[PDB]
Design a protein around this ligand. Structure first.
Ligand SMILES: *[C@@H]1O[C@H](CO)[C@@H](O[C@@H]2O[C@H](CO)[C@@H](O[C@@H]3O[C@H](CO[C@H]4O[C@H](CO)[C@@H](O)[C@H](O)[C@@H]4O)[C@@H](O)[C@H](O[C@H]4O[C@H](CO)[C@@H](O)[C@H](O)[C@@H]4O)[C@@H]3O)[C@H](O)[C@H]2NC(C)=O)[C@H](O)[C@H]1NC(C)=O
Ligand SMILES: *[C@@H]1O[C@H](CO)[C@@H](O[C@@H]2O[C@H](CO)[C@@H](O[C@@H]3O[C@H](CO)[C@@H](O)[C@H](O[C@H]4O[C@H](CO)[C@@H](O)[C@H](O)[C@@H]4O)[C@@H]3O)[C@H](O)[C@H]2NC(C)=O)[C@H](O)[C@H]1NC(C)=O
Ligand SMILES: *[C@@H]1O[C@H](CO)[C@@H](O[C@@H]2O[C@H](CO)[C@@H](O[C@@H]3O[C@H](CO)[C@@H](O)[C@H](O)[C@@H]3O)[C@H](O)[C@H]2NC(C)=O)[C@H](O)[C@H]1NC(C)=O
Ligand SMILES: *[C@@H]1O[C@H](CO)[C@@H](O[C@@H]2O[C@H](CO)[C@@H](O)[C@H](O)[C@H]2NC(C)=O)[C@H](O)[C@H]1NC(C)=O
Ligand SMILES: *[C@@H]1O[C@H](CO)[C@@H](O[C@@H]2O[C@H](CO)[C@@H](O)[C@H](O)[C@H]2NC(C)=O)[C@H](O)[C@H]1NC(C)=O
Ligand SMILES: O=S1(=O)N[C@@H]2[C@H](O)[C@@H](O)[C@@H](O)[C@@H](CO)[C@@H]2O1
Ligand SMILES: O=S1(=O)N[C@@H]2[C@H](O)[C@@H](O)[C@@H](O)[C@@H](CO)[C@@H]2O1
Ligand SMILES: *[C@@H]1O[C@H](CO)[C@@H](O)[C@H](O)[C@H]1NC(C)=O
Lengths: 392, 390
C-alpha cells in the first residue's frame, strides 16, 4: 500500500492473545477489555521504555464495540467498558506520544459477534478518522463470498484513503481466502500495509513451530511480495506470557526479525520479567527487524532437526538464525562454511560476526574460506549479524 | 518389592534425557558419557544442596558398556570412557554419601545396541552387586516374547535378592507389555521397586501433558498398587533444561509430587538457573512427594481445560493441584467447594490452606461450607496443602 506508512514493519501492542474477549469487568476487572486497561498499557509503554525501543501503536482488537450502532448508524464504544469513548482514549494515547489502533470486520459481524462494517465502509472509515485512529486491523469473519471479501478489503482501503488521515491498514484477506483459492499477493499488497497469512498464534511452542513450518513451506509464494509499505504478518509476539521457555522466546524474537514481521506484543506490560523485557527491547534485534532495505528473509536449509534462516540487510550485512528443532538432549554443534551464507556475498572477502542471541558476543573476522561453529539449545536459536569487510 | 527400599519414592539424578548416548569424548569431553561426567555431578550433588534436599541416587543410563562382554563373559565399562571401572566409581560416589545406579536390558541388546542380559541374569546381578551398585534400571528392548519379558524381569529380581546387597530395582516391564496385553500391576509390584508405564519423557510441554493424560486415563488400574516399596514411574524431571516455561516446570514438580513419582532429575547440575534449582530443592513440595503414608494421588476432575488432582497425606493433610490446560489468554479463575476436596474430610469442619506453588503463601482458614477461588497461569499449576483443624 503506497500510503507512505509501514516503510519498516509496524511495532506496538495488541490485546488479543493475552486479554482476548474478556467482557466480565465485575469478576475479572484486571483482564477485561476497558478504556482503563488501554490507558494503563499506554502509561507503561512510555514509562517502561517500550516507546523508546520503537513500540508505537497501542491497538484495540475485537470486543471494544457496543452491541448495536447508534441512531445515526455509526459504531459506538461499549458504554460500560469505554464510557469516555474512542475520541478521548485517542487524545490520551496521542498525549503520551503513541498512536491508537482499532479493529473491525469486512463482513456482517466481528468474529466475536459485534457489528460488522459491510454497508458502512465509508461512515466507519470516517468514524475512525474523526476519532483519531492511526491504525485499523480488518478481520474477515461473516463474509458470504470471495467477491465480498475482496470488494470489502479494497473498499475499506479507498474509504480510509478518502478521509485524508494517515491510517496503517492491517488486513486478514489472505487468511480468509485459503479455504477457497490461493491468494494473489500483488493484489493484496496494493491495498494493505500488512496481511495475516496463517491461523491465530497462541501461547505455545507448537504454535510457533506451526507458523515457522507454514512460512518456510510457502516461502516462494510470499517472501518476495514483502517490502516497504507491505509486510507478511505471522501474528503477535507472545514473549512475556506463560507458554514459551526462554529458548522458545529467543526463537520467536530471532525469527520475527528474520521474517520482517510487524512486532505486535500481546502480553501484560504490568507483569513482565526483566529477561522477557530485555529480549523484546533488544536494540540490535529490533534493528534487524527494522532494516531499511526491508527484504524478508527465508529458510536456507533444513535437515537433522536443524534449520538455517538468513535475511539480507542494508550495506552487504546478513542476519543468520540457526534453530535446533530436537526437543531432547543438550546443545547441538552446527558448522557451516561462511561461503554458504549471504549468497556467498556476506563474507567475501571477509565478514565480522556478532552473536546477538541468546547473548551478545563479538565472534571476530571470518575469511571467505572460514567455517562458523555454533552450539544451539534445544528449541532455541542462535542469531548472528554478518558485516561484509575488507579488513583481514 | 519388599526389599526394605524405596519406602518413599527414590530421589536422584539420571543422565539419559539431557546427555543421552553422547560417545564423542574427543570433540565433546564436557558432555560425553564418561566417569568424569558422573564425578562432576556427584561433587555438585554434595556442594549445591541436592543430597541435603534428598537427591541420593546418581544413576548411569544406557551407553556405559564396552561393545562386547569380557573373556569371563561379564559386562564391562567402556575402557576409555570409564577407565577406573564401575566398582571404583561406586567407591567415589559412596565416599560422598550418595548411591550409584546403573542400567541393563532384559533382552539380547540394550536399546542403544550394547550387550543385553538375556542368558546372563545371575552373573549380571552378581557383577552389579560386586561393583557396589545401589540401583538397577532394567530396560525391555530386544525381547522376542511376553514370556521372555516376564521371566527376565522376575528372574533378575530374584537374582538381585540372592546377591545379599540392597539394590533398588527399577523396571520397564509394563511399558514393553502394554502394546500387547494389559499388565498385572499386583505381580509387577511383587518384583519391582518402580516401573515405567509410558513413553520416554522429552524436554517439551507436549511430553508432560501426554504423561499426565496417560496417568489420569489409567488411574483406576495403577493408583492403588502404588505404596512404600513400589511406585509408578512417569519418567525423569526435566526442570533446568530448555523446553519448559517456568509455569510448565511448576506443573511437572507439582504433579510428580501428587503422583508419588520417583524424582530423577536429568539436567546439567553445572548449568542450572537459580529458579530451577529452588523449585527442585523446594522443601515443602519434596515433603509432599516424600510423604511417609505413600498413597498416590489422582485426578479428581477435568473440564473447561482445567484439571483438579489431589493426594492424601499423613496426619489428616491433603495436597491439591489445579492445572490450567488453556494455552492462550491470561491467568484463569477456578473455584471449587472445599467440601468436594479430600473425599469430604479435608475441610470438615475446617482446614488451613497453604499455597506452595507457584509461590508459598498462607491463604487462611476455610470452613466446610467454603469455596476455594484461584487464578491459574496457562500451562501452570497451583499446588495447595490442606491441614484439617482437628
Ligand atoms: C491515498 O492514496 C494515494 C495513492 O497512492 C496516496 O498517494 C501517494 O502518497 C505517497 C506517500 O506520500 C507518495 O509517495 C511519495 O511521493 C513523493 C513524491 O514523489 C514523486 O515526486 C518526486 C519529487 O520529489 C519524484 O522524484 C518521484 O520520482 C515521484 O514521482 C515522495 O516525496 C515520497 O518519498 C519520500 O518518502 C518515501 C516513502 O514513502 C521514500 O521512499 C523517499 O525517500 C522520501 O523520503 C514518496 O515516494 C505517492 O507519490 C502518492 N501517489 C500518488 C498516486 O499520488 C496517498 O498518500 C493516500 N493518502 C492517504 C492519507 O492514505
Ligand atoms: C530378599 O527378599 C526377601 C523376601 O521379601 C526380603 O525379605 C524382607 O525384608 C524386609 C525388610 O528387610 C522384611 O521386613 C522387615 O522386618 C524387620 C524385622 O523383623 C523390620 O525391622 C523391618 O522394618 C522396620 O524397620 C524400618 C527401618 O527403620 C521401619 O521403617 C519399619 O517400620 C520397621 O520398623 C521390616 O518390617 C520382610 O519381612 C522380609 N520378608 C521375608 C519373607 O523375610 C529381603 O529384604 C530381600 N533381600 C534383599 C537383599 O533384597
Ligand atoms: C535372543 O536371541 C536368541 C537367538 O537368536 C533367541 O533364541 C531363539 O529364539 C527363537 C524365537 O523364540 C527360537 O525359535 C524357536 O525355535 C523352536 C525350535 O527349537 C521353534 O519350534 C519355535 O517355533 C521358534 O522358531 C530359537 O530356537 C532360539 N535360538 C536359540 C539359539 O536358542 C532368544 O529368544 C532371544 N531372546 C529374547 C529375549 O528375545
Ligand atoms: C493479481 O492482481 C494484480 C493487481 O490487481 C494483477 O496485476 C495487474 O492486473 C491488471 C488488471 O488485469 C492489469 O491491467 C495489469 O497489467 C496487471 N499488472 C500489474 C503489475 O499491475 C495481477 O496480474 C493479478 N494476477 C496474477 C498475478 O496472476
Ligand atoms: C495378578 O498377579 C497376582 C500376583 O501374581 C495374582 O494374585 C495371586 O494369585 C494367586 C492365585 O490366586 C494367589 O496364590 C495369591 O494369593 C495372589 N497374590 C496376591 C498378592 O494377591 C493375581 O491372581 C493376578 N491377577 C490376574 C487377573 O491374573
Ligand atoms: O479468533 S478468531 O476467529 N481469529 C480472528 C483474528 O485472526 C484474531 O487475530 C482476532 O482478531 C480475533 C478477534 O475475535 C478473530 O477471531
Ligand atoms: O530411547 S529408548 O528406546 N527408550 C528406552 C528407555 O525407556 C529410556 O528411558 C532410556 O533408558 C533409553 C536408553 O537406551 C531406552 O532406549
Ligand atoms: C450481510 O447480510 C446481508 C443480509 O442477509 C447479505 O445479503 C450480505 O451478503 C451479507 N454481507 C456479507 C459481506 O457477507
Amino acid at each position: 500500500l503506497d500510503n507512505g506508512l509501514a516503510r519498516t514493519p509496524t511495532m506496538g501492542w495488541l490485546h488479543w492473545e493475552r486479554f482476548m474477549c474478556n467482557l466480565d469487568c465485575q469478576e475479572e476487572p484486571d483482564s477485561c477489555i476497558s478504556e482503563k486497561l488501554f490507558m494503563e498499557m499506554a502509561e507503561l509503554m512510555v514509562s517502561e521504555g517500550w516507546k523508546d525501543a520503537g513500540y508505537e501503536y497501542l491497538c484495540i482488537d475485537d470486543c471494544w464495540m457496543a452491541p448495536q450502532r447508534d441512531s445515526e448508524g455509526r459504531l459506538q464504544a461499549d458504554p460500560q467498558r469505554f464510557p469516555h469513548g474512542i475520541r478521548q482514549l485517542a487524545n490520551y494515547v496521542h498525549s503520551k506520544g503513541l498512536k491508537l489502533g482499532i479493529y473491525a470486520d469486512v463482513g456482517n459481524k466481528t468474529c466475536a459477534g459485534f457489528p460488522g462494517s459491510f454497508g458502512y465502509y465509508d461512515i466507519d472509515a470516517q468514524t475512525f478518522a474523526d476519532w483519531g485512529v492511526d491504525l485499523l486491523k480488518f478481520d474477515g469473519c461473516y463474509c458470504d463470498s470471495l467477491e465480498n471479501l475482496a470488494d470489502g478489503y479494497k473498499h475499506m482501503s479507498l474509504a480510509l484513503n478518502r478521509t485524508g488521515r494517515s491510517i496503517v491498514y492491517s488486513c486478514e484477506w489472505p487468511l480468509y481466502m485459503w479455504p477457497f483459492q490461493k491468494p494473489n499477493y500483488t493484489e493484496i499488497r496494493q491495498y494493505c500495509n500488512h496481511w495475516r497469512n496463517f491461523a491465530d498464534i497462541d501461547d505455545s511452542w507448537k504454535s510457533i513451530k506451526s507458523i515457522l513450518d507454514w512460512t518456510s513451506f510457502n516461502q516462494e509464494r510470499i517472501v518476495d511480495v514483502a517490502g516497504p509499505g507491505g509486510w507478511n504478518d505471522p501474528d503477535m509476539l507472545v514473549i512475556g506470557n506463560f507458554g514459551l521457555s526462554w529458548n522458545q522466546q529467543v526463537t520467536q524474537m530471532a525469527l520475527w526479525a528474520i521474517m520482517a514481521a510487524p512486532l505486535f506484543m500481546s502480553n501484560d506490560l504490568r507483569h513482565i520479567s526483566p529477561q522477557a523485557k530485555a529480549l523484546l527491547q533488544d536494540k540490535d534485534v529490533i534493528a534487524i527487524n527494522q532494516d531499511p532495505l526491508g527484504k524478508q528473509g527465508y529458510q536456507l536449509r533444513q535437515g537433522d532437526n536443524f534449520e538455517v534462516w538468513e535475511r539480507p540487510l542494508s550495506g552487504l550485512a546478513w542476519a543468520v538464525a540457526m534453530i535446533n528443532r530436537q526437543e531432547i538432549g543438550g546443545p547441538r554443534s552446527y558448522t557451516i562454511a561462511v561461503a554458504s551464507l549471504g549468497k556467498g556475498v556476506a563474507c567475501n572477502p571477509a565478514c565480522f560476526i556478532t552473536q546477538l542471541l541468546p547473548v551478545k558476543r563479538k565472534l571476530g573476522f571470518y575469511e571467505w574460506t572460514s567455517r562458523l561453529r555454533s552450539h544451539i539449545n534445544p528449541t532455541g536459536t542462535v542469531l548472528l549479524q554478518l558485516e561484509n569487510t575488507m579488513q583481514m
